[PDB]
Every structure is written in structure tokens, then in C-alpha cells.
Amino acid sequence: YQDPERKLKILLDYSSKIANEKDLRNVLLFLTDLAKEIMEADRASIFLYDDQKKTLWTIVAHGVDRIEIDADKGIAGYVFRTGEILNIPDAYKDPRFDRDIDKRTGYRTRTILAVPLFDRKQNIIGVFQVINKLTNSVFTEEDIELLRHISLYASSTIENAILYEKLKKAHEDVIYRLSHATKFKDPETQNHIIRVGLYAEILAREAGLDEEDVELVKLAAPMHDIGKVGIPDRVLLKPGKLNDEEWEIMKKHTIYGYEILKGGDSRLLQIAADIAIEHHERWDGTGYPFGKKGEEISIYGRMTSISDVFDALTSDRPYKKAWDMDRTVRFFKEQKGKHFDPFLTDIFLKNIDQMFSIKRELR
Amino acid sequence: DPERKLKILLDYSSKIANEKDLRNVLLFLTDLAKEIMEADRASIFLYDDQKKTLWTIVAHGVDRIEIDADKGIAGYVFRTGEILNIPDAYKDPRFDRDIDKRTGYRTRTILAVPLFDRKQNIIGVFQVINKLTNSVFTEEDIELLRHISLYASSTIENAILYEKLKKAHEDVIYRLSHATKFKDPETQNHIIRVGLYAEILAREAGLDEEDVELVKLAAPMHDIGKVGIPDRVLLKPGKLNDEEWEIMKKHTIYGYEILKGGDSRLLQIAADIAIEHHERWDGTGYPFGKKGEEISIYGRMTSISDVFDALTSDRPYKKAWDMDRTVRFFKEQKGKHFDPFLTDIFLKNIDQMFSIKRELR
Ligand SMILES: Nc1nc2c(ncn2[C@@H]2O[C@H](COP(=O)(O)O)[C@@H](O)[C@H]2O)c(=O)[nH]1
Ligand SMILES: [Fe+3]
Ligand SMILES: [Fe+3]
Ligand SMILES: [Fe+3]
Ligand SMILES: [Fe+3]
Ligand SMILES: [Fe+3]
């Protein structure tokens, strides 16, 4: 006997998968599989629109690239421009049908149902198409109803994924640019601020931290030096080396960064605050500003020291050319258990190649 | 025609996928469950680390109701992780009948299942009540509710993740915008409020809701260029001479330099506000003397909001101007300092502004 709720449960499960998926490619793929099953069709395709190339595009297989599709030709084309549903009972009796892809692969297209996708503001953003109904000779009025509902769901989840990406990009952008507000009074570069987070990301990942904390350090670490905004010009702008009154002030950029960042409730800012205050502490206890020792420094602080020192050593600075990989590895082996967390130093050494390809790609 | 429930589900999950507010997501889920389980009532309970209780929200959008995580039906499901299927609540000792007592309701059947997160911890309870057959929840019902519960967990976790991102995004812009706190007196709240005013101004000016959200977040960053102004000027104890004032005025350019090129819309707008917020509608402002609509709307809305906050704050010898005095000032400055059209919107709404200044002092 059949389960009367069988398709309902299938749909619930697909909905859970989609709700969890941040990658648009996979969202599309899942929506396609969902349509094949619920519509009882052999094939399905979603076509979206590109502003820039003025085309529709789709994913063919799992894990391969966009196929360009003419936004004005074919069944997809008609539906995209007109906004109206097409239900073709025999594809070969229809002049809008491209017989080619069908004839290169040994496939036979009989039935096609295509409806548009709409955004919140009722504009046409693409097409949803199913091909070859399996359990009937044609797509029915009921099939059309169902596909329209599927289409509404597809539009929403598609939009929600785009928006979530835009918000994520904006969040990074803001952290990056504001962290570099020191640019008028301090030599450290925009890409240094970014790379420090990228190295610490690798480190947290390979140390087995939760996916969320991997994302956190990537974004918290870039802010480690923001307290420099509160250092007097006479100390920050001093050419060369520094006296032991001025040094006592320069050290305070840790405290100042903490002061700027502590007034959050988000986990991001609690971590960023910790990093700002901890990033010159040494595994030793011989760092500043408090000479904290070992696990007394949070893992995020420990991961940032390693990253920050790594980036410095590998750039040109006053009097000193960037160190190469070999010398860098020698230095870290030496400083393992001193300046740095010994555990975290091993992870970092295991992954030294990515550290360098980051430094190479982001100059 | 068993496709009725498929279509109901796709409608609900369309609404959910759009829904940014956790409150609403829970309401949509319980309505979904009511229709799909063919039941009269449903509730979701979530746990709180801090207060150590479960909670639930009722429709109408009232406050969250706190529930004892130890006693009760939901309590039981939360502690044990076991499913509970009660054919008659008025026979089960774990049932508290007071809810019926206040509402004029009669609870008969209760089916309650755990909610699990990605990591597989019990994060809540999904409870469905009074199946419309007036008979028990069946083994097939339990099975259906299980799939509903998985969808609910996913959507909840996904909504919480978005709120945390949203909240972090604000925190970061607010705090780093106040990075000037060591060398300049403008407060954290001033920085927040200016955005809050401009949000209302933008909405009432008819702007798109996404753009309204951008100004709320972009305007607070307009003075960030102050961090590049030399101490010998920003920290000078006298009043500034002409040479020094010209340097101070560059905080506009400096903010632009800090913010521009960032590819997102947020930062493009923020950069404009940074560089335009001292421009004056009539062209007598700085740094460029831009005139009318040569100033982006966002620039124009921030000037209005910034002046508003200044006029309405106490300083020594200088008491905050009240409503009437402030209205008069904006009337005088219409078409000079400020955009006439936007000033009218602002005036129409000035009571909302004063409420903000009252709540976030
Ligand atoms: N041992 C050593 N450390 C360096 C050198 N250049 C930069 N650093 C490190 O870089 C840290 C801060 O990084 P930066 O401020 O240059 O990004 C300093 O605490 C310091 O330990 C160097 O030539 N030798
Ligand atoms: Fe530092
Ligand atoms: Fe540094
Ligand atoms: Fe200002
Ligand atoms: Fe200003
Ligand atoms: Fe201000």
C-alpha cells in the first residue's frame, strides 16, 4: 500500500535541505530535483537572468558551469519576456522548440511546461521548466497550478539566498574599510587587515573549531589594531624607533581597541575586543600589556598573534626585505612554545603553503 | 487533489523564506502545522540559556510567554527528548489546565515532539493540539509531525543565524563609527540616533524599504574621517584659526577616502554621506559648495538629521532647544542649509524624532 502523505513528506525534507543551504548552485539543484519528483517529470531546469551579459543561464549537471541561454529564443525565451505560461503537448509540433540538444544526445522531448519566476516586486526574474511528464501523456491544468506554487517557493528561496550573500559581503566590506581608518597615520595596508583574518580562518578551521567561530575569527581578527586611532600623533607618527615613555603609550593601543569594541553584545565584538587587547601577548607570558600566559590568552588572541606576525615578516618594512618561506618556517619553529602557541604553531606550519598563496594573491 | 496540502506547504514556505523576523517565522510555522496536521492549535517552545526557561509567542504579536522547562508537557519533552502523545489531556497529570481556564478552551489531544539543532541538541518543542477528528493523533500523524519538526528546526536556525548577522552588522558599524571616542566628544548614541532619524525621514520621503535600511546604517559613519585629522588641530585647546579650520573641513574628504571603492551599496552611500554631510542646499557649504540635487539625497537627509540631534542636546551654557524653537529653525533654514522638500517631510514627522531622542538619550 501507498502512503497518502508521501509527497508531502518528500517536500518537507527538500524544504529543510534548501533552508540550510547558503550556496545558490546547490539551492538551484535541489529545487530542480524537487520539481522532478513533485511534478513527476523526467527533467527540470531553472533559468535566471544576467543583467550584464543580457542572457538567461542554467546549471546542467551538478558541479559544472552556467550554460548561456538566449533570453529571446525558445520556450524559456517566450515565457521570460511575455510572462505567460506555456504548456506544450508535443514539442516537435512546436516551432519555438530547439531540436538540436535533443538530437545530439539520444533524447526525445515530448511535453514541456514552463512558467515564469517573479520577485517580491512582481518582476520577471526567470523561468521554471519541466520536461516529459512520466505518469501522464500531458501536463494538466492541475500540473500548471502546482508548478506555479513551486515557482513562488523557488523565487523566494532564490531571493533570500541572494540577499543573504549581499548582506554578508556588505558586512565584510564594512569591517575591512573601517578597520583601515588608521590609513592616514599608520603604514599598515588594507590587504594586511584582510589577510590577517584569512590566515586565522585557516588556523581555526584546522584546529577543529565550530564553523561559526571559523567565520568569527576571519572577521574579528582584522580589527586588532583599531585602538591606534586613540594614540597621540607624536607617538604614532614618530620616524624610526621609540623611547620608553612613548612605548608605554604605544602599548596602550591594545587597551584602546578593547575600549572601542567591548560595548557590543554580539559574539563578533566580544571576540574582536579580546583580540584587540590580546594580540601582543606571548605564549611565554613575556608580552604586553599584562604578560598573560598560555591559556590565559583566548584562542582567538593566540591565533591572531601567529597570523599578524606571519604577515609582517613576509612584507617589506623599514630596513628589512620580506622573509621567504624557508626563513619564515625557521623562525616559527624557533618561536614555537615561546612567542606562540605550540599546538597552533604546528597547525600553521602544516598549512604554510596556503598562508603563502594568500599572501601571493592579495598583495 | 492530495495536492491541496502540497500547495498549502509551498505557500507557507514561500512566506517563511522571505520572513526576516523570528517572531513571524514561528507564527507561520504554527499556522502551517495547524493546516497540515488538520489540528486546531499548535505551539513552538524554544529554550533560553540565560533565564533557563522555555518560551513561546502567541499570535497578535504580544510579548514572549515564559514556561517552566521542568514541569508540564513541553517541559517533559524538552528534558527527555521523548515524544508525548496524549489522547486526553484531562487525564494526564503533567497537564496544566489553567490555559483552558482563562481562554474558554478545552484541550483534548496533545502531541509534542523535540526540536534538534544541526549539532543534534534539544533546542525546543513542537506541540500540536486538538486534532480535528476529535480522536487521537495517529502513528502516521507522529511521523508527519517529525518531518514538520525537521523543517521547523532548519528554518528557525536559519532565522536565528540571520538575526545574529544583522545584529553583528549593526554593532560593528556603531562601535567602529565611535572609534573617534578618544579625541572627539560626539557620543555613541548620537551616532546611532542620526541613523534612526534618517531612517524615518527616508521612509516618509517614499524611498524603497531596502534603501531606508541603508541610510539607517550608512549615516552613522559620516564623521569617520576625523581619525585622520592631525592632533595639533582636533586637540588644540584654543579656537581654530583659518589654516586649522581648512584642515578640519578635510574630515569630509578623509571619510570618503576611508569608505569608497568598497563594492557594496552600503559603502558607496556611506562614502557619499561622509563627503557631503556639510554641503548646504544653497551651495554655501563645504568642502565643494555643491548645490541642490548635486548633493545625493542621502547626504541631504543626514545633514537634517545631524543638525536636529545637535540642537536638541544640552551643552554647558547652551540648553537643548525645545520643539517650537527647533521647528522655527528648520523653517528659517528651508532652501538654505536644507532641502525644502525634505524639510517639510521632517517637520511633518518631528514628533517621531523627539521620541527617538527621548528613548535613546
Ligand atoms: N621578530 C620580528 N618580529 C617582527 C618583525 N617585523 C614585525 N614583527 C612583529 O609584528 C608584530 C606586529 O605586526 P605589524 O604591526 O607589523 O603588523 C610585532 O609585535 C612584531 O612582533 C621582525 O623583523 N622580527
Ligand atoms: Fe598591535
Ligand atoms: Fe600592529
Ligand atoms: Fe560632526
Ligand atoms: Fe562632520
Ligand atoms: Fe554628529
Author numbering:
A (entry chain B): -2 to 360
B (entry chain A): 0 to 360
Relevant lines from the article:
Here we describe the first crystal structure of an enzymatically active HD‐GYP phosphodiesterase protein, PmGH from Persephonella marina EX‐H1, a thermophilic marine member of the Aquificales.
Structures of complexes of PmGH with GMP and c‐di‐GMP were determined from crystal soaking experiments with both nucleotides. Crystal soaks with GMP and c‐di‐GMP gave identical structures of PmGH in complex with GMP showing that PmGH retained phosphodiesterase activity in the crystal. This would then enable the conversion of the now bound 5′‐pGpG to GMP.
